[PDB]
Amino acid sequence: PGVSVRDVPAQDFINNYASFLQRQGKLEVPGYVDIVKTSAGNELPPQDSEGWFYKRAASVARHIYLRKQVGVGKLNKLYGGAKNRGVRPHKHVDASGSINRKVLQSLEKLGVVEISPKGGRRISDNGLRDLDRIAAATLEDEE
Amino acid sequence: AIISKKRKLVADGVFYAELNEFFTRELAEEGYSGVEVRVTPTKTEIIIRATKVQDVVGENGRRINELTLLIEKRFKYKRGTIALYAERVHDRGLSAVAQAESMKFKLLNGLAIRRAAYGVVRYVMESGAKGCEVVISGKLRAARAKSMKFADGFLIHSGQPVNDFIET
Amino acid sequence: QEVVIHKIRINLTSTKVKQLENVSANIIKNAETFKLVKKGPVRLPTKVLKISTRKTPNGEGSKTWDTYEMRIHKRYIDLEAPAHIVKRITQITIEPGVDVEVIIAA
Amino acid sequence: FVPVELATTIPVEIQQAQQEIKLFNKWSFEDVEVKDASLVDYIQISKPIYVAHTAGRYANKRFRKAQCPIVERLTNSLMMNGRNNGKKLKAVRIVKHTLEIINVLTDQNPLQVVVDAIINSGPREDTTRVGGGGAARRQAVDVSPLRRVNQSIALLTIGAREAAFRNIKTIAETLAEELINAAKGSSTSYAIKKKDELERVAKSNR
Amino acid sequence: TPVTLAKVIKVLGRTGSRGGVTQVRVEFLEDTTRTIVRNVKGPVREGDILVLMESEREARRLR
Amino acid sequence: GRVRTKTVKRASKALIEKYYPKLTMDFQTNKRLCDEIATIQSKRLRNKIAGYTTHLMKRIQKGPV
Amino acid sequence: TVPSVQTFGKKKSATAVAHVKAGKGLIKVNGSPITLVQPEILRFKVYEPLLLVGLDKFANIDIRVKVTGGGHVSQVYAIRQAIAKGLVAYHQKFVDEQSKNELKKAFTSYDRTLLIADSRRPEPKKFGGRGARSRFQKSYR
Amino acid sequence: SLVVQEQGSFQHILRLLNTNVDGNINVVYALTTIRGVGRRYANLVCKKADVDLHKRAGELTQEELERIVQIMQNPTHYKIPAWFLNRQKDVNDGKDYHSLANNLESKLRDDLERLKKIRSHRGIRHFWGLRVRGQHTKTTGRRRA
Amino acid sequence: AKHAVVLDQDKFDRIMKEAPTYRYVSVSVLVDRFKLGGSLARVALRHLENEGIIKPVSKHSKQAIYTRAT
RNA sequence: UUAAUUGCGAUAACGAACGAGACCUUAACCUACUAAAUAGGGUUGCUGGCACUUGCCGGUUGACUCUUCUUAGAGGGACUAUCGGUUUCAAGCCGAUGGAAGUUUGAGGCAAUAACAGGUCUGUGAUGCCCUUAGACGUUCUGGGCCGCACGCGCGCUACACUGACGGAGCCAGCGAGUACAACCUUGGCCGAGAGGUCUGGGUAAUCUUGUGAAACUCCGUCGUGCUGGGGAUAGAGCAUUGUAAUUAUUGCUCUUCAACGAGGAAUUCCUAGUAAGCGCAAGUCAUCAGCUUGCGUUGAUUACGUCCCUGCCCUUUGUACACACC
Ligand SMILES: [Mg+2]
Ligand SMILES: [Mg+2]
Ligand SMILES: [Mg+2]
Ligand SMILES: [Mg+2]
Ligand SMILES: [Mg+2]
Ligand SMILES: [Mg+2]
Ligand SMILES: [Mg+2]
Ligand SMILES: [Mg+2]
Ligand SMILES: [Mg+2]
Ligand SMILES: [Mg+2]
Ligand SMILES: [Mg+2]
């Protein structure tokens, strides 16, 4: 046999990663938690509020696993969306700049993210271990 | 220069289209038709088709050497890289613009407008056209405007066989 | 004595296709006579230039439009060949209209 | 029977509901015979398909709309209104839940209730406006027979959307109830009442 | 409700002042060989079947 | 709305006139037979000619016309 | 060296390239397996070609796909058409033709295109309107 | 998370800051009901109280209400960045401040007066009862205040 | 307002007595018995899947159907 | 019959041209060619992690090779093809089979005769003649003004929510476009809740921006049908950015304000398939502004596949004190 990351669906993975981060509690805090919009178009901050950021960095981690060299802006642009701009139509604008940077900076210290050449960030050795274990753990919950 | 490929080729087309309209206005007396601008390395062959070729040349480098320097001062070039050659037209009747400037002159000079058209049509049929037309408009006598139409043979208006065949 | 291969790329960009394709055929046929290692006539995507414009001057009557566009045919013929053989293939194989051009620097 | 080991592991529940029987999404597609000519060879359960979604070049010839599955026509009619125009994915989800409601509702195959609903809600005779000098006299004309199918399909989902507007009762909960009321000929639903309204309008103009 | 189950033999052209109606001759299923030309609202093909309340009442071309 | 044009029907009438032989019922043969003889500029037009020639051959089997 | 085919698949403008191989039975897409896809309701539409023919054909045949262009439900249909051809191209190449006919017979009876490359490309949104056919809104009041 | 066990029935309204805090519902959306609070500010305030947003909070503890009210009164003392405010930058050289109740509607009426005193192109248009921010009312809105 | 939003212990007890032996179980069908509002019913549906008692059929956000434990 | 004066056919007409068609451009098919480290894959090197057997995912322009996808040349391919009825067993139409394509294959591009007192003298050193021609109606600066509002219509956008809203999470496009004499697109890194700064690059462009990981969508939660968390208008204050200059908010962002409006009367617009409808992108104008627009791709139905009932047009016969032609 052979265990892998993808066999676990992304919804259940990020939840299992979030719970994994809550068990440690050493992912770190940015300093703007629940005094923050998250997306520059978004009338209400995160509803889960407390926690939340652990689901966020898990999401950035699995995106950086899947892709070659993802930076800040590409995350912003990915995680952005539709402004309820008014009686005018919608537009796309990239999500909050700093928060995603604080997600990345925190993931660098833990050892999930590694700095890549050319432009952006890639994955560490010890980051890949936790990804695979969390994948193995969620597969056991399904069985 | 260097500019982008897509901006150079549009600036070349403009440059040509400027030159084209200059030589329409400047070489009216000479009976000019069209330019064929070739752009090789170092030299660029700006060929100019016209009826009265001896008038375009002048007296062995005179009018062409005025115009070469004019093209250089418009578009920043140096002497040597631009070279003018005034050639004859292979059958003048087939080219529409040549006939246009002849009809232009015949009206300007003083001639019967109807017969001016009929004479130029007969010339075009003699040269070797499957068909032809002349529309002349405005006020050919009287105050109120008219069009007047003088033609011969098969005239295709529609389809692509138009850009290929009919010189307008 | 030299045999110093600089790796030269040839640029062929133009509007007309039947000239361009004939020009591109002429260079590879010269490469076959001079017998060089070369990548074939590579064909890059055609940048179509779309000037949208209302047909009218006055902006009155019905609202009609003309997409006045320009075809462009960007091609490449990469040579693994010396400087002197490139100087030959620049001198010959020159047609009107098509923009022959050399990069020369790998 | 016989769960074959593929490298990309498939769940045990999915591997069972495969191969041996030509099922629907999870449960079987068989049975659901109409026993009422006109609607046979148009309300086609005879064509077995596993999901209520196709590309389906049915809108081209003329009678290719008949060969389309009845479940897709329900997702298709559920797409009405500009808020929900396009978006089959949502409608397929809604069609999934209506059938799950009917499976819970007194057992029974849910496609039977879907088809039994369409049969009752199809009008027999419908009036069309004739000129006839000037006044608005309406001759009773016979309906035939995709038009009965097509009008019933809309009539059903109109009963759903009318109930759905300003309501807890989810479009699937409404539609399933409309199908249930149309299966057990009750005349409480919008599809049956509107069938009855025209019928009535057919008898008056004869 | 006494229903008469009817069946098509020939579509007798598209009729009516408006386009959405059709004259069609009908050989009904039970008790065959009693042909009646009755109108039709929707799309039709030969061998189709018609559900209707009122059968024996022949219709004409609508003005 | 597939009614073949005049030139199609005019040529194909003049084609079968001059070449009843060299026209085997089926299309692809008659198609290649058309491009041999008559000097068509188009592809579609040539294919459409061949299309009528065939319909003339298939009538020819069921008596004259 | 091993017996392999590179079976493409297409819808609107989506493009899936299903490589097929010999082995245990991988059916992967961009690295991730068959089981995900992740429009979720149309998981079963990419299971359709597998269940029709049977899981037994995948004990030998090992598929792997890479999808580009289009949207979600298109790329599903791109994958889906890359899969159905994947088997037929393998059964045409390295297995009997009677099986490949039995595949095509099963595909044609339950034909939601699958083997047939889909025809429909978008009409240009020509002027005097919002879309292609859809005109503006004249007024004479 | 948990359905309301125990006797319950702990007051339907609930008055706060001379205004009606609606019973049941939620803190955030009972706060919006107060004249001067919105959705994003009230969600900011609920964080400092450490009450669940899932809870209905018409059955609140009295000490929790006193925290909330103090958070409304004082921005700078508590952890509020101080440009998340209703008013900011006002009087001569000093501090930002805001209100969220009867204090705010009075402050707005005082700022409306301040605009009327200065007689600005905004303030002149407030006197008319018309369109301040250069919006065209050639066609739109033929009823008005 | 049409009421049926107020939370009580008397209403808590009636929901538990009105739980077992019920074909349809969803957010709509609880509210159709003039019960606690949409989400309060939705929360009440969540408690009825704590330790069996009512088992699930669908799992969707708003389309959350359940049925009694047979 | 045809979409077509498109053809059969009957025939003082016969054979012709124009227009239609053909043509052209584009969008559809090629495991059949020619091609690629600016397009993508396979083995293998080094190398990251796993289960720990051989196996799985990778990351590297380390090698070697391939052209399915990709481009894009050159070709072909569809002809209503084959079969069936149906029709003077004609022109053709209708249904099955295969076939990428069976709606003129889809869409446009050009588009005749004759004109119209249509519109343009505000695109024009295109222009006749009346205007003017230094207190210029020339030019040029400087401030305004076109945007004002009792009120009429006309395109548009946002909504009147539970097929929802709001959070997260998942996360897939295509047309494009873009600076070296300027100041363009602007990744990557830090600062900032934002907007936006800054350093640095890459890119004159299948190479960098850019997989423009766009939106609507899909999943799990919060509210449940109350002018409610629907709906965002009006407002106040600040924080940004363009420009010499922003008040008559340029735009963006911040928090606050929470108005009208529970699907709209008489009327009438648009539409027959990858269309309508939704959704966003995109260039155009642009220093700065998108509710606009010409393009683009995503989601993708309903209902005909007819008829002359209305509307318009066209012929034809008929009438006509009309021919500046029903004003
Ligand atoms: Mg909105
Ligand atoms: Mg012609
Ligand atoms: Mg044409
Ligand atoms: Mg066409
Ligand atoms: Mg005029
Ligand atoms: Mg003038
Ligand atoms: Mg104006
Ligand atoms: Mg318009
Ligand atoms: Mg790009
Ligand atoms: Mg409100
Ligand atoms: Mg008209």
Curated annotation (Swiss-Prot), chain E:
Alphabetic keyword roster: Ribonucleoprotein, Ribosomal protein
Gene name, Swiss-Prot/TrEMBL: RPS28
CDD domains for the chain: S1_S28E
Superkingdom as given in the UniProt entry: Eukaryota
PROSITE patterns per UniProt: RIBOSOMAL_S28E (PS00961)
A single BP term in Gene Ontology: maturation of SSU-rRNA
Classification via SUPFAM superfamilies: Nucleic acid-binding proteins
Organism: Kluyveromyces lactis (strain ATCC 8585 / CBS 2359 / DSM 70799 / NBRC 1267 / NRRL Y-1140 / WM37) (Yeast)
Entry's Gene Ontology cellular component terms: cytosolic small ribosomal subunit
Record GO terms (molecular function): structural constituent of ribosome
Higher taxonomy: Eukaryota, Fungi, Dikarya, Ascomycota, Saccharomycotina
Family in the record: Belongs to the eukaryotic ribosomal protein eS28 family.
Protein's name according to its UniProt entry: Small ribosomal subunit protein eS28
UniProtKB/Swiss-Prot annotation, chain G:
BP term (GO), one: translation
Record field: compositional bias (Basic residues): 132-141
Domain of life from the UniProt record: Eukaryota
GO cellular component, one term: cytosolic small ribosomal subunit
UniProt xrefs under InterPro entries: Ribosomal_Su5_D2-typ_SF, Ribosomal_uS9, Ribosomal_uS9_CS, Ribsml_uS5_D2-typ_fold_subgr
Listed PANTHER family: RIBOSOMAL PROTEIN S16, RIBOSOMAL PROTEIN S9
Identification of the protein by name: Small ribosomal subunit protein uS9
Record gene name: RPS16
